Design a protein around this ligand. Structure first.
Ligand code: DGD
Ligand code: CLA
Ligand code: CLA
Ligand code: CLA
Ligand code: PL9
Ligand code: PL9
Ligand code: LMG
Ligand code: LMG
Ligand code: SQD
Ligand code: LHG
Ligand code: HEC
Ligand code: OEX
Ligand code: CL
Ligand code: CL
Ligand code: NA
Lengths: 176, 97, 244, 36, 334, 33, 51, 137, 152, 30, 32
């Protein structure tokens, strides 16, 4: 039912075109990135604090020592990527900040979709497209798709409306 | 002045009867005895100036002439419309199911 | 000797018409009491020239060159039709069937793409009278049909079309509809073109002929959306003759 | 166009050669602890 | 001190502002090629016949695109999986029409990212680190291979690879769902769980650490000046952290070994993204998502719809409309 | 394209106003040193 | 009737003045269509100045 | 709604005799149809010739009529084209062509009636969905 | 019927037909209303009166489907023309206006009748001035909509 | 004008990359 | 009045750019 909700929003609201969703995507994916990259950095800059091959045992919850080298991690990432973190407090605040913010942003976009205040069209494109049958973008291609979704899904998804679409009115491309 | 010629055609007998000059071949399934054999023949030998002209197709068994006779009232003829006969669209007009 | 698929595949030779040896200067005689066909007609363009529009009025623009951007997809071939002898001894080829169209797009200086349906559809071409023999001086001249580049089911990027599609600019729901009429109402053109086939090689032993061709036809008009350009095509041809 | 093809075939061969001979030039020994 | 040996010593120097290395010897030119062709194409490439039907699609800014709708358009279906370098085209005008830049960019880019990954192992070796950060990066790298290479290989055409553009991306993920019901595929579901899960734990770890910083500053100063680069003692108290989260849920659903906690952080999103990379890669071979269409019926044989059929209605409208001019026959088999 | 004309002044100020704010704060931070 | 100087072209005449005259698009400011200017076209002079 | 005998009563021949199937036959038919036929005829369409479906109304206007158990059983023995003008066992699975369509080899005579019976009952249950295609999925 | 009441019965004043980046007054979209053209009555060749199925607020676009009093579809604008049963051309559909600027006027030629059928899904049919504000023809939301959005 | 704007912002971001790597506040120890 | 569109952006930057310069220079004078 949630999957259907996802696809409702594409065809009716064109929700992928919405910058507030895009900033949400960037915050969720930014979070999963930071999660993976931070776990991996710590785990591959560990200090040798025990003899054994399982490096988990050589951590004590009460040691005051940091258990990995922030310094060797900073060098690694400075030389690999060009910048690294240098402040372990900023790093962990940034890990809070990114995914929280992203979610808050998508929320604001949904609030607008409550009112059907969609980010549905680019006017300049529709104006040229209408005047110019040779002008096609991935933007015009995606609205044919949403137009399909609407017409093929609406009668069964909104049964209270008694939508009757006879075959001849359903938007379809050639052969399919 | 700019019209859709396909839409204009739907306002002629083409929109009610099988048009011997224009209709895709799959419409001959709506009547028995017609598809595929006679339908193949009618489409190959179009166009026709009158509905009755179908009976003069060379090679028609006398049984074939009677299946056409029974069905002449479901036929008709209008001017050939280029948009419906170009492309081999009388054999395949891109509609399946 | 003839080659196999695996010999030819990926070379571009599949897009080339058969050649005749430059010794083939014979003549092929025509028994008006016989009928003949063309077992295979092959047309291979080599040049695409487009007519420019020169702004003023009494200058008339020239034909300019273009670049082909659709690769080795240009030749017509496997064409066949009746070859007739008329009262006066003229010969008339009548195209029956074949791969008689190729979509092509060339690009003018300035990067305008010009698409066209290169074709000899419904070619009826005829010689002088009193031929009596096909020679290296025989010239066919004929006209053919140029149907619309897209057929009736074709949908433009807003879902508009002729036998299918929307009848308006649905993205502009309360827009002034008259100014979009030309773009909303699709029209199916059907024009004529001219062709000349100049025979320069004849193999009297085998009824094969080869020569040069020049045709004139209109370009794509995008279902009535813009005005077409005038196109000149030059190339070579091959044809095989046969008794019926 | 053919000239271009030559130039790219040469460029690529040169960088791939660099790569292979680079790693055959004692690469395990290039670390900060144990060299052999 | 031999010529070759000085060179080998610069390539592998850990003193270069950016590390080069042997993997870098391949990565730098391949990524400079991809980058320079991407920027130039996004700004100025003319329209591309992505689907082989002589219906060019405008991707670039000077041709009426904006940052959202622009793309480098995939190469023509007419080419399918054929290799289309520049020197195989009769001219650059042809190569532009048929989508050659996309092939040039994606191939250079794949190579250079493959080498980015090795470069990550290489520097870890030169610095005396453990080696496995590159295994973490293998999940995105795998995901990029999936949508630029594998999925085209399996469908037969680079024209069904992912466009290099924001709206192009959405096109490709819409059509993927009509053709593969990827939402109902379990490996995509783990990907969502991998990516929702990593966003959650990102925020957890960063909120719990931030919650248990040790007072080092005043209220007039950023708490971040409590930490100095390379200080030897931890800057938060992990037992206060364990004691909070263990009481929020219960004691044993909270960590207190920081090594296990960070390995868990690393492993959850990496594994979930491996799977979703596998999903795209196996749907490349049309082993599609679960199909529950008409699975529920009544005593007579009436269909009783479920949400799965509602999804299918949606999928159907996606199917019948994509590449609307492109199919002459009733089954879109690839 | 028939793009909205205040798009430009909107974009230019959206960029310039907060950028200048940060530049002002940074420069006068550094001359405290 | 629409030369460069009616079009507000400032630097195009200075490239024209010393012998650059054609575009990689295939036009030239002397009306010739179908010319191949090589690298030193209007576009290539611009790019080289960026580099 | 349940699978009642009214719905399970199908014409037997063109003279309009009728035959009522058990539930067992109906499900046997549904099994055998999936084994031997659905690969082309899932839903009552024909994947390799969409112009011809198994809607009862199309079967009714087939020459020899096929809207009955006899016509259908015959068609499985000796398929023809829609106008009955030429035999197509070369290219359509049938008992007469089980040499080349091996799944037809082990179909007894009762199997054929269950298949025929399944095809005439199913449009009564599903209506337009049978032969309708994706529009009605 | 007061024109003021007829204007409320028009989807272009529905605050849920807007867009986030479609800026300015509603007038910038459908134009400045000048006149109620009249209430439009569709009939087929049988004399049956037909009804345009109104667009709901969810849909940026909507098919043109004419129904009878009893809900039964009797005409539409077909997308695919080849198997069309219900087209205006085949069904002989006509539009008659009562009230307003077109009171007493009847149109029969199909391209005109489809034209008003298209606007009838918006409800009552109005004459707009699109030149004055260079209106682009795309619905915008009202102050009711913009206030709710900001304050939520 | 919109193309100039999109490309100008992109170019400014590439410029900031350069400064942020080569002209960063250098990390110093204890 | 049919005025120049770019006039607004030319006027605004004409004010904004040189003013900001002076503000940057003044505030960092004060904080030293
Ligand atoms: C950043 C941090 C690290 C530092 C990095 C170091 C800095 C180095 C950065 C350098 C990068 C520079 C940017 C490269 C621009 C690419 C130029 C191009 O694509 O330029 C190509 C140009 C353009 O070609 C023209 O391209 C045109 C394409 O037009 C298109 O474009 C037009 C607009 O321009 C119109 O829109 C037109 O409609 C549209 O179709 C036409 O096809 C013309 O016929 C065609 O001539 O071609 C030519 O003439 C060029 C010459 C090639 C001719 C072939 C001869 C072979 C010579 C090959 C040389 C190989 C290089 C050596 C390698 C190394 C060995 C030491
Ligand atoms: C790369 C792909 C991608 C990514 C990363 C995202 C990411 C996101 N999308 Mg988009 N989406 C995409 C593609 C993507 N989207 C596409 C292609 C479409 C089609 C248009 C959509 C359609 C879409 C819609 C329709 C919506 C999103 C939403 C979201 C957000 C969900 C936030 C969240 O955690 O909700 C998870 C939910 C919560 C965090 C709510 C609270 C959950 C509580 C804490 C759980 C309690 C559990 C409890 C203990 C019980 C457990 C028991 C039970 C599990 C058994 C997030 C920003 C949503 C959004 O923006 O909302 C603001 C939204 O509604 N997306
Ligand atoms: C809430 C809704 C939701 C959510 C959370 C997700 C989440 C996800 N989806 Mg799903 N999806 C949804 C709805 C949703 N989807 C819907 C509704 C549809 C159907 C319409 C889909 C259709 C769909 C498809 C078709 C695909 C996904 C994929 C994905 C994944 C995208 C992230 C990824 O690939 O990481 C992986 C990481 C990367 C791709 C990054 C590669 C990084 C490279 C190596 C480096 C790039 C460098 C760059 C160019 C330069 C930058 C640096 C420079 C600026 C300095 C993720 C698991 C994708 C997937 O599984 O991909 C494998 C995929 O193909 N989804
Ligand atoms: C509660 C506030 C409020 C509300 C509801 C309105 C409502 C309205 N105004 Mg007024 N107005 C307001 C405040 C408000 N105004 C203020 C403060 C000013 C001075 C700036 C004006 C100046 C003004 C003028 C000059 C005009 C209007 C007009 C209008 C109408 C059209 C609005 C429109 O198209 O917006 C479009 C809305 C948007 C484009 C949305 C902008 C928000 C963006 C998307 C977010 C910004 C990015 C942000 C940083 C997100 C990232 C953050 C992240 C890091 C967390 C409408 C009735 C117009 C009218 O019709 O006149 C009669 C008109 O010409 N208003
Ligand atoms: C040529 C033309 C003109 C160009 C066109 C190109 C074009 C298409 C581009 C489009 C660009 C475009 C519009 C972008 C869209 C982006 C968009 C959605 C914006 C997001 C905006 C927004 C504010 C969203 C809210 C959510 C938000 C705050 C997300 C932030 C995302 C973010 C920056 C996450 C971090 C990702 C990242 C790679 C971090 C690396 C972290 C890192 C340095 C780790 C290294 C590291 C780890 C350790 O553990 C330790 C110990 C140390 C020491 C250490 O170092
Ligand atoms: C008619 C009548 C009267 C009817 C009868 C009805 C009746 C009266 C009903 C009333 C019943 C009654 C009153 C209620 C009592 C019943 C009760 C017990 C209810 C159940 C409550 C309930 C449903 C709870 C929901 C369960 C819940 C969601 C728990 C989920 C557990 C779980 C999945 C948690 C995640 C665990 C996990 C591994 C997280 C890791 C996160 C992460 C990596 C953290 C990072 C991190 C972790 C650390 O650890 C530390 C250290 C640090 C540094 C750090 O970074
Ligand atoms: C300090 C301020 C300056 C620095 C900020 C930089 C500028 C920021 C620009 C943001 C506005 C961008 C809109 C551009 C549109 C424009 O150019 O058209 C200009 C439009 C006006 O519309 C104009 O109207 C004209 C006839 O009047 C015609 O219609 C013109 O064509 C039309 O463009 O501007 C607005 O309408 C301004 C209204 C702004 C108020 C919106 C409030 C409601 C939303 C609040 C939601 C808060 C979100 C929280 C986010 C977290
Ligand atoms: C730094 C940031 C920018 C600084 C603030 C902006 C200052 C702009 C001031 C220039 C005003 C430009 C005219 C107003 C805007 C507008 O109308 O421009 C609009 C015009 C552009 O012209 C546009 O052209 C279009 C087609 O290309 C259409 O025809 C439009 O009608 C037309 O507006 O702006 C330019 O032409 C700018 C040219 C600037 C170069 C002038 C060279 C002469 C300079 C020598 C003077 C020496 C001064 C000595 C003083 C001591
Ligand atoms: C029909 C029957 C079927 C049978 C199937 C059986 C299934 C089990 C197979 C899996 C076994 C794998 C071993 C796991 C243990 C291990 O990893 O140790 C590593 C550490 C060590 O623990 C640490 O252990 C340490 C002691 S020692 O190192 O282990 O000796 C100790 O120091 C430390 O405090 C403690 O935390 O464990 C953890 O911290 C928990 C991490 C969980 C690892 C898996 C990640 C899940 C990814 C899936 C996400 C996808 C969603 C998208
Ligand atoms: C060989 C080539 C290798 C690849 C080169 C790629 C270089 C790209 C990296 C960008 C450098 C600029 C970052 C400036 C910012 C910068 O200077 O950061 C520096 C900052 C240093 O953190 P410290 O902990 O040192 O500082 C905190 C203290 O100062 C407290 O005030 O690091 C970050 O916070 C890490 C998070 C940045 C994570 C986001 C950056 C990545 C986003 C990149 C996507 C760009 C958008 C593209 C749009 C088209
Ligand atoms: C593809 C390999 C098929 C299989 C397996 C089955 N059928 Fe079929 N069927 C197929 C085609 C291409 C056609 C059209 C034949 C023609 O050219 O006329 C048919 C036709 C039928 C019909 C007639 C439908 C009508 O409207 O008249 C029937 C009744 C039918 N087929 C039945 C049937 C049965 C019972 C099958 C399983 C034993 C079966 N078919 C398999 C293609 C294929
Ligand atoms: O190309 Mn892109 O997209 Ca995979 O299927 Mn077939 O092909 Mn096209 O349709 Mn659906
Ligand atoms: Cl598509
Ligand atoms: Cl196909
Ligand atoms: Na059943």
């Amino acid at each position: 039912a949630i999957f259907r909700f996802l696809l409702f929003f594409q065809g009716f609201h064109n929700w992928t075109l919405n910058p507030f969703h895009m900033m949400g995507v960037a915050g969720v994916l930014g979070g999963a990135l930071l999660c993976a990259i931070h776990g991996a950095t710590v785990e591959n800059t560990l200090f040798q604090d025990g003899e054994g091959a399982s490096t988990f045992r050589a951590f004590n919850p009460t040691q005051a020592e940091e258990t990995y080298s922030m310094v060797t991690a900073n060098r690694f990432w400075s030389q690999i990527f060009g910048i690294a973190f240098s402040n372990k407090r900023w790093l962990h605040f940034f890990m809070l900040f990114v995914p929280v913010t992203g979610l808050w942003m998508s929320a604001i976009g949904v609030v607008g979709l409550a009112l059907n205040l969609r980010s549905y069209d680019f006017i300049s494109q529709e104006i040229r497209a209408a005047e110019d049958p040779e002008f096609e973008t991935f933007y015009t291609k995606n609205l044919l798709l949403n137009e399909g979704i609407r017409a093929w899904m609406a009668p069964q998804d909104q049964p209270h409306e008694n939508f009757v679409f006879p075959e001849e009115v359903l938007p379809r491309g050639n052969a399919l | 002045e700019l019209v859709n010629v396909v839409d204009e055609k739907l306002g002629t007998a083409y929109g009610e009867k099988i048009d011997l000059n224009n209709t895709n071949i799959a419409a001959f399934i709506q009547y028995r005895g017609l598809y595929p054999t006679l339908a193949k023949l009618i489409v190959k030998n179009a166009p026709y100036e009158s509905v009755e002209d179908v009976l003069n197709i060379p090679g028609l068994t006398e049984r074939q002439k009677q299946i056409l006779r029974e069905n002449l009232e479901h036929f008709t003829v209008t001017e050939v419309e280029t948009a419906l006969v170009e492309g081999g669209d009388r054999y395949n007009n891109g509609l399946y199911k | 000797q003839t080659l196999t698929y695996d010999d030819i595949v990926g070379t571009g030779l599949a897009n080339k018409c058969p050649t005749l040896d430059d010794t083939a200067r014979g003549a092929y005689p025509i028994d008006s009491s016989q009928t003949y066909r063309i077992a295979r007609l092959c047309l291979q363009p080599t040049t695409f020239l487009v007519k420019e529009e020169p702004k003023n009025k009494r200058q008339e623009a020239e034909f300019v060159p273009t670049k082909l951007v659709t690769r080795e997809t240009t030749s017509l071939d496997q064409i066949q039709g009746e070859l007739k002898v008329n009262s006066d001894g003229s010969l008339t080829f009548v195209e029956e069937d074949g791969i008689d169209f190729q979509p092509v797009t060339v690009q003018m200086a300035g990067g305008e793409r010009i698409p066209l349906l290169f074709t000899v559809k419904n070619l009826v071409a005829s010689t002088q009278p009193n031929v009596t023999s096909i020679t290296t001086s025989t010239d066919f001249k004929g006209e053919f049909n140029v149907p619309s580049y897209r057929t009736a089911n074709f949908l433009d990027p807003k879902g508009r079309g002729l036998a299918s599609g929307y009848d308006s600019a649905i993205a502009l729901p309360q827009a002034k509809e008259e100014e979009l009429a030309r773009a909303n109402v699709k029209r199916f053109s059907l024009t004529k073109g001219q062709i000349s086939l100049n025979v320069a090689k004849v193999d009297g032993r085998t009824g094969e002929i080869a020569g040069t061709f020049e045709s004139e036809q209109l370009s794509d008009d995008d279902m009535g959306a813009h005005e077409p350009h005038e196109v000149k095509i030059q190339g070579v041809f091959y044809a095989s003759i046969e008794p019926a | 166009m053919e000239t271009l093809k030559i130039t790219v075939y040469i460029v690529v061969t040169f960088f791939v050669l660099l790569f292979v001979f680079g790693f055959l030039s004692g690469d395990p020994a290039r670390n900060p602890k144990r060299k052999d | 001190a031999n010529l070759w040996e000085r060179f080998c010593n610069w390539v592998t120097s850990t003193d270069n502002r950016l590390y080069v290395g042997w993997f870098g010897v391949i990565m730098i030119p391949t990524l400079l090629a991809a980058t320079i062709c991407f920027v130039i194409a996004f700004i100025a490439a003319p329209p591309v016949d992505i689907d082989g039907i002589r219906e060019p699609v405008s991707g670039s800014l000077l041709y009426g695109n904006n940052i959202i709708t622009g793309a480098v358009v995939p190469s023509s279906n007419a080419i399918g999986l054929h290799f289309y370098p520049i020197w195989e085209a009769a001219s650059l005008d042809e190569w532009l029409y048929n989508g050659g830049p996309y092939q040039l960019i994606i191939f250079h880019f794949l190579l250079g990212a493959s080498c980015y990954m090795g470069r990550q192992w290489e520097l870890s070796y030169r610095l005396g680190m453990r080696p496995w950060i590159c295994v973490a990066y293998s999940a995105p790298l795998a995901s990029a291979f999936a949508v630029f290479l594998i999925y085209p290989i399996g469908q037969g055409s680079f024209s069904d690879g992912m466009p290099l553009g924001i709206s192009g991306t959405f096109n490709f993920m819409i059509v993927f769902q009509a053709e593969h019901n990827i939402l109902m595929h379990p490996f995509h579901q783990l990907g969502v769980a991998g990516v929702f899960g990593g966003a959650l734990f990102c925020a957890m770890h960063g909120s719990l650490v931030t919650s248990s910083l040790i007072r080092e500053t005043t209220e007039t100063e950023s708490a971040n000046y409590g930490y100095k680069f390379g200080q030897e003692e931890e800057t938060y108290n992990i037992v206060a952290a364990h004691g909070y989260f263990g009481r929020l849920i219960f004691q044993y659903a909270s960590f207190n070994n920081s090594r296990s906690l960070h390995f868990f952080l690393a492993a959850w999103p990496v594994v979930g993204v491996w799977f979703t990379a596998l999903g795209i890669s196996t749907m490349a071979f049309n082993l599609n998502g679960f199909n529950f269409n008409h699975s529920v019926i009544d005593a007579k044989g009436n269909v009783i719809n479920t949400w799965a059929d509602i999804i299918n209605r949606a999928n159907l409208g996606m199917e019948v409309m994509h590449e609307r001019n492109a199919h002459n026959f009733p089954l879109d088999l690839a | 394209m028939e793009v909205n004309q205040l798009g430009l002044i909107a974009t230019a100020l959206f960029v310039l106003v907060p950028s200048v704010f940060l530049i002002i704060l940074y420069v006068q931070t550094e001359s405290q040193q | 009737l629409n030369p460069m100087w009616r079009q507000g072209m400032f630097v195009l005449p200075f490239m024209a003045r010393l012998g650059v005259t054609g575009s990689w698009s295939g036009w030239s400011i002397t009306g010739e269509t179908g010319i191949d200017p090589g690298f030193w076209s209007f576009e290539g002079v611009a790019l080289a100045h960026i580099v | 709604a349940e699978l009642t005998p009214e719905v399970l009563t199908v014409p037997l021949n063109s003279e309009g005799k009728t035959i009522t199937l058990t539930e067992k036959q109906y499900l046997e038919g549904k099994r055998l149809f999936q084994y031997a036929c659905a690969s082309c005829h899932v839903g009552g369409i024909t994947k390799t010739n969409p112009s011809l479906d198994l809607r009862t109304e199309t079967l009714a206007l087939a020459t020899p009529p096929r809207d009955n158990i006899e016509g259908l059983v015959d068609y499985m023995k000796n398929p023809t084209t829609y106008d009955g003008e030429q035999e197509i066992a070369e290219v359509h699975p049938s008992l007469r062509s089980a040499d080349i369509f091996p799944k037809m080899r082990n179909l007894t005579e009762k199997d054929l009636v269950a298949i025929a019976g399944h095809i005439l009952v199913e449009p009564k249950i599903l209506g337009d969905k049978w032969g309708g295609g994706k529009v009605y999925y | 019927i007061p024109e003021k009441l007829a204007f409320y019965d028009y989807i272009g004043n529905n605050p849920a037909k807007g867009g986030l980046f479609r800026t300015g007054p509603m007038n910038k979209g459908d134009g400045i209303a000048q006149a109620w053209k009249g209430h439009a009555v569709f009939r087929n060749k049988e004399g049956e009166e037909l009804f345009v199925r109104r667009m709901p607020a969810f849909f940026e676009s909507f098919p043109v489907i004419l129904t009878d009093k009893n809900g039964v579809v009797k005409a539409d604008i077909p997308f695919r023309r080849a198997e069309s049963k219900y087209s205006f051309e085949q069904q002989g559909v006509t539009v008659s206006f009562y009230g307003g600027e077109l009171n007493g006027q009847t149109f029969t030629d199909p391209p005109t009748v489809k034209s008003y059928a298209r606007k009838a899904i918006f409800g009552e049919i109005f004459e707009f001035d699109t030149e004055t504000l260079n209106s682009d023809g795309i619905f915008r939301t009202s102050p009711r909509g913009w206030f709710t959005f900001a304050h939520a | 004008m919109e193309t100039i704007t999109y490309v100008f912002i992109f170019a400014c971001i590439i410029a900031l990359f350069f400064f942020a790597i080569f002209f960063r506040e250098p990390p110093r120890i204890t």
